[PDB]
Amino acid sequence: MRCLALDIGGTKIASAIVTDGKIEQRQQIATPQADAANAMHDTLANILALYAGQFDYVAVASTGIINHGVLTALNPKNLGGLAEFPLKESIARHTDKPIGLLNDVQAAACAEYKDEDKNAVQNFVFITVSTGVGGGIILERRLLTEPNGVAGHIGHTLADPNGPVCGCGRVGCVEAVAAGRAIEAVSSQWNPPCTPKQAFELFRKNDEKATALIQRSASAIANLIADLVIGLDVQKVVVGGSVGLAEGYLPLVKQYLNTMPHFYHCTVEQARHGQDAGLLGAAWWVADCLKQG
């Protein structure tokens, strides 16, 4: 089975043929910015032409939210000229093979899940802690995507009803307490200012103020994990992203989780897939859909 996988990001569009989880014929180009909507139709025409006859199906990971084949977002302006872009329709102009679309965190979730023992692990959550907090949720071995592609936006679940206002407008989201943006909102105000990277370095040197800031983030992620375990019977959580993978961070998350009653505990491990997670995860998911009907 030959998959044309596309990974459409904020800056780069990666494309490849994926066969048996193996990547070939890589290309990377800039995500259209000038006349973005018009330009994207051209780009997609170009990509599908370049790979003509090379694929049995198309799988597309994209930042934002996929709502019935259309690119959208909680705040649509974060996508600029691609807000409400008719992604599946534009690709279908150029091929009659099946086309599956998911968002980039859902694709990364699938990349990490494909290597699991599916008999042992059927309820699985990927959390990325980066500039923001994103998630992808797999229950009974199947990714949650219906009906409108929003499932997995667990960065926007409540962390503290007295916490800061989130970028989305809700008071106290996980993302407003735990994300890199949230760490930098505090560390940038220090005298002198520090980046999140510098805050982590001080944390590893036992600076008490920097430690408090990292603990604020890690404890919020621990409480999200506990919610997922008790609300959904999640069995395993994998954590990635620049903050999620920072040295010392996941051990702190797991320390907070383990202080809670035993029925909130689950397997928590670091993400193992890198740049190609979107291509591989999207390819795995669409094939899974097709195999299942």
Distance of alpha carbon 277 from alpha carbon 148, whole angstroms: 23
Stretch that binds its own copies, among 15-23, 207-215, 257-265, 285-293 (CB under 8 A): 257-265
Nearest to 60 by CA among 96, 89, 21, 101: 101
Task: Please report, as residue ranges, which positions from 263 to 282 form the binding site for its own copies (by CB under 8 A).
Answer: 263-264
Distance of alpha carbon 159 from alpha carbon 168, whole angstroms: 14
**Shortest separation between residue 233's beta carbon and its own copies, angstroms:** 4
Report the run of H or E that residue 44 belongs to, with start and end.
Answer: helix 36-50
**Shortest separation between residue 242's beta carbon and its own copies, angstroms:** 23
| Residue 148 is a binding residue for its own copies (CB under 8 A) | yes
- List the one residue from 90, 106, 128, 223 that touches its own copies (CB under 8 A): 223
Task: Please report, as residue ranges, which positions from 137 to 176 form the binding site for Zn ion (by CB under 5 A).
Answer: 156, 166, 168, 170, 173
**Shortest separation between residue 168's beta carbon and Zn ion, angstroms:** 3
Residue 192: name its binding partner from its own copies, Zn ion, none (Cβ under 5 to 8 Å by kind): none
Nearest to 51 by CA among 5, 100, 107, 102: 5
| Residue 74 is a binding residue for its own copies (CB under 8 A) | yes
Question: Tokens standing for 53?
Answer: 């006859």
**Shortest separation between residue 153's beta carbon and its own copies, angstroms:** 5
Residue 169: name its binding partner from Zn ion, its own copies, none (Cβ under 5 to 8 Å by kind): its own copies
Phi, psi for 226 (deg, rounded to 5): -60, -45
| Residue 122 is a binding residue for its own copies (CB under 8 A) | yes
Contact 41, 50 (CB under 8 A): no
**Shortest separation between residue 137's beta carbon and Zn ion, angstroms:** 17
**Shortest separation between residue 119's beta carbon and its own copies, angstroms:** 10
- List the one residue from 260, 267, 288, 289 that touches its own copies (CB under 8 A): 260
Count other C-beta atoms under 10 Å from residue 129's C-beta: 32
Distance of alpha carbon 222 from alpha carbon 227, whole angstroms: 9
Output the DSSP codes for 201-243: HHHHTT-HHHHHHHHHHHHHHHHHHHHHHHHH---EEEEEHHH
Site residues, its own copies (CB under 8 A):
74, 122-123, 135, 137, 139-140, 144, 146-154, 156-162, 168-171, 219, 223, 226-227, 229-233, 235, 260-261, 263-264
